[PDB]
Design a protein around this ligand. Structure first.
Ligand code: NI
Length: 174
């Protein structure tokens, strides 16, 4: 069995999807934002706008198959990233708020541009998925990407303990 998008159809490996929440009341899709002294928007964050599908995210399995297997690792990159970013792939860097989800200004190695994994959420007509962060075990997926709203309203994506993200993947019109 593989990952299913928010309409029942199999998630197409490499395709573009909007990562929206289970409950639309929780917010909108995932986009970018300029936090810190970033020269541009390099912080992956959720949209405060309940009607915003957000940026279409590209999901690329670790397998070169047509579909993405259930426990497969996946790279997640913005279809239309910001100019300043070297590559369009989400990545995980350390920070005070813990591991944070950000875009990089210089190229990224495979071991960094391939650290996420989707996990099904049991009882739901529609397939919902939590987002895991897998790290270097000299791989271990046992960290859940969640939200952390910073003092400026930014609902950043950062590994958290409570309230992990629960997403539905809606195919984005190419
Ligand atoms: Ni803060």
């Amino acid at each position: 069995d593989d990952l299913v998008d928010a309409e029942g159809n199999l998630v197409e490996n490499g395709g573009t999807y909007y990562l929206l929440p289970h409950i639309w009341a929780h917010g909108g899709g995932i986009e970018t934002a300029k936090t810190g002294n970033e020269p541009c928007p390099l912080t992956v964050v959720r949209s405060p706008n309940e009607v915003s599908k957000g940026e279409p995210i590209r999901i690329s399995s670790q397998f070169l198959s047509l579909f993405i297997p259930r426990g497969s690792l996946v790279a997640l990159g913005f279809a239309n990233p910001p100019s300043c970013a070297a590559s369009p792939w989400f990545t995980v860097v350390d920070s005070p708020q813990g591991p944070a989800v950000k875009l990089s200004q210089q190229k990224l190695p495979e071991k960094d541009a391939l650290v996420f994994k989707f996990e099904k959420v049991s009882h739901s007509n529609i397939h919902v998925y939590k987002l895991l962060y897998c790290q270097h075990d000299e791989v271990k997926c046992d960290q859940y990407i969640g939200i952390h709203r910073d003092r400026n309203g930014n609902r950043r994506l950062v590994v958290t303990e409570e309230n992990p993200l629960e997403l539905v993947l809606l195919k984005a019109k190419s």
